[PDB]
Amino acid sequence: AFAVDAAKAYKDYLASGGQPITNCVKMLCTHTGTGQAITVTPEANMDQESFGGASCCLYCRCHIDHPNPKGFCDLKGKYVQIPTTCANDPVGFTLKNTVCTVCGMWKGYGCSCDQ
Amino acid sequence: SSQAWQPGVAMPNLYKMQRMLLEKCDLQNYGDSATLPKGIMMNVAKYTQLCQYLNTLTLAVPYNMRVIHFGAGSDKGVAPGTAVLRQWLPTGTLLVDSDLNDFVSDADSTLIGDCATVHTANKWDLIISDMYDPKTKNVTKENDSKEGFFTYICGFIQQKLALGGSVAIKITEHSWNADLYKLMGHFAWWTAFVTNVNASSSEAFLIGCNYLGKPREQIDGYVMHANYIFWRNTNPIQLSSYSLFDMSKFPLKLRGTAVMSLKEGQINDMILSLLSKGRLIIRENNRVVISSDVLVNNEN
Numbered sequence: 001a002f003a004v005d006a007a008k009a010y011k012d013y014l015a016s017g018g019q020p021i022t023n024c025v026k027m028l029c030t031h032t033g034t035g036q037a038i039t040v041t042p043e044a045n046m047d048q049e050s051f052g053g054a055s056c057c058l059y060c061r062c063h064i065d066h067p068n069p070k071g072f073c074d075l076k077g078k079y080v081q082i083p084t085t086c087a088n089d090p091v092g093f094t095l096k097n098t099v100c101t102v103c104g105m106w107k108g109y110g111c112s113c114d115q
Numbered sequence: 116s117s118q119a120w121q122p123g124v125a126m127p128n129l130y131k132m133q134r135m136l137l138e139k140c141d142l143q144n145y146g147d148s149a150t151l152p153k154g155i156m157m158n159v160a161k162y163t164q165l166c167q168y169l170n171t172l173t174l175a176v177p178y179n180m181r182v183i184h185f186g187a188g189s190d191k192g193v194a195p196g197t198a199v200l201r202q203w204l205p206t207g208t209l210l211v212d213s214d215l216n217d218f219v220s221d222a223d224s225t226l227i228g229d230c231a232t233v234h235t236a237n238k239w240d241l242i243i244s245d246m247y248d249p250k251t252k253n254v255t256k257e258n259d260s261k262e263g264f265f266t267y268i269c270g271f272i273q274q275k276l277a278l279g280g281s282v283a284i285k286i287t288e289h290s291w292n293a294d295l296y297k298l299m300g301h302f303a304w305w306t307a308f309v310t311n312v313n314a315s316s317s318e319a320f321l322i323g324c325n326y327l328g329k330p331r332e333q334i335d336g337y338v339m340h341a342n343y344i345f346w347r348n349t350n351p352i353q354l355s356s357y358s359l360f361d362m363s364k365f366p367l368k369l370r371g372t373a374v375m376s377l378k379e380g381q382i383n384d385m386i387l388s389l390l391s392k393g394r395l396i397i398r399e400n401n402r403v404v405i406s407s408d409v410l411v412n413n414e415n
């Protein structure tokens with residue numbers, strides 16, 4: 001019945017003025033990539049930064065189990081594209097947002113399947 | 116001059132041929148820093164330049180390539196170098212990393228513990244080591260060849276590096292080992308490579324290119340480290356981050372290098388020639404299995 005809710009704890013810590021998790025590993029890249037959210041190699045476009053996935057995963061960084069029943073990590077071993085305006089808090093961004101299952105872009109940050 | 120637009124500087128061949136005595140390393144540019152792009156960590160930049168330089172060598176790049184990375188953890192609890200290696204290496208490359216202390220990593224498997232506890236069934240195509248103990252930078256005592264993890268690395272190379280494979284091993288003025296330099300002569304080619312972002316440091320990567328499994332050349336490692344320090348002492352390297360802004364040719368080219376299993380009796384000069392040119396890897400192609408020894412203790 002009981003299970004720590006790390007996702008909720010980080011959001012509340014942020015809302016009350018906490019410093020976002022640091023030392024997410026930012027990659028060098030051309031910034032001419034597809035702009036998709038989560039990729040096997042950095043794909044930032046001109047408006048994004050690419051980060052090593054594991055360093056942007058709340059569960060990886062906090063040393064706690066992943067919410068997936070299999071304990072699989074969506075980010076580890078991959079690269080996550082974060083909008084430049086949100087790159088001060090990549091863990092918060094990946095936590096709060098969701099990836100369009102059709103085009104692979106972030107909902108509301110690239111995905112246009114709704115027009 | 117033109118060196119500031121390169122990823123770094125490799126030790127020129129003439130310095131390798133000297134017979135210098137070991138001196139203190141005194142870097143004119145000591146304490147300078149390069150200007151890193153906004154938000155980029157020193158270790159991302161350093162690994163990026165190491166990979167850009169490795170792109171200019173004749174690395175074997177087979178399908179199902181196997182790379183192991185020692186000293187992969189940072190005091191930040193993450194693995195910046197591993198992230199760059201994974202970016203650099205072809206998608207699907209098996210990447211294992213390791214460190215003494217816990218860290219979160221993008222590698223396919225991570226082993227935590229002293230490197231001497233690491234065992235692998237299989238052989239590897241590329242070994243990268245950033246292992247370093249800052250307690251070696253003691254300028255008050257004599258600077259002798261060091262053992263510790265360097266003893267492990269030499270043994271690991273001789274037992275677990277595929278023929279045709281390559282290595283890049285971090286050394287410094289005081290963190291070095293004579294047998295490792297000697298082992299450089301068991302590759303078709305070798306160098307000590309200084310990254311332009313960290314050129315104010317005596318750090319270098321000792322790079323052995325295409326392993327042959329026997330001495331092609333006899334190298335005295337105490338002399339060669341003296342030669343390396345001589346080179347560093349007399350050739351200031353201008354700090355530079357210029358190469359970090361051009362990543363269009365960064366990915367390691369997937370050459371599909373051939374992998375064959377062969378027995379020591381069959382390594383003829385034709386084979387040795389293909390090894391030397393980056394055109395062949397010799398090892399089994401079984402599954403990759405690793406483990407770390409755990410010491411068991413009951414303190415009650």
Ligand SMILES: Cn1c(=O)c2c(ncn2[C@H]2CN(C(=O)[C@@H](N)Cc3c[nH]c4ccccc34)C[C@H](O)C[C@]2(C)O)n(C)c1=O
Pocket residue numbers: 140141142143145146252254288316317
């Ligand atoms: C440990 N070590 C060196 O220690 C070293 C060095 N290469 C050169 N030095 C210099 C250092 N140094 C400078 O170069 C100054 N610009 C920088 C500096 C300003 N404040 C300091 C306070 C403490 C230490 C340094 C400084 C001053 C002096 O010359 C001493 C010395 C040993 O030779 N290398 C490769 C090396 O590994």
Ligand SMILES: C[S@@+](CC[C@H](N)C(=O)[O-])C[C@H]1O[C@@H](n2cnc3c(N)ncnc32)[C@H](O)[C@@H]1O
Pocket residue numbers: 158185186187188189190194195196197213214215216228229230231245246247248263264
């Ligand atoms: C310079 S740090 C590398 C971290 C850097 N941020 C990166 O991305 O690689 C060097 C590492 O060597 C490791 N190390 C030193 N001696 C070791 C040993 N005997 N066995 C295993 N790791 C060792 C330390 O834990 C240390 O983190």
Ligand code: NA
Pocket residue numbers: 249251252287288289290
């Ligand atoms: Na040192």
Ligand code: NA
Pocket residue numbers: 174175176240241279280281
């Ligand atoms: Na190789």
Ligand SMILES: [Zn+2]
Pocket residue numbers: 054057058059060061066073074075076
């Ligand atoms: Zn994770």
Ligand SMILES: [Zn+2]
Pocket residue numbers: 100101102103104105111112113
């Ligand atoms: Zn979409």
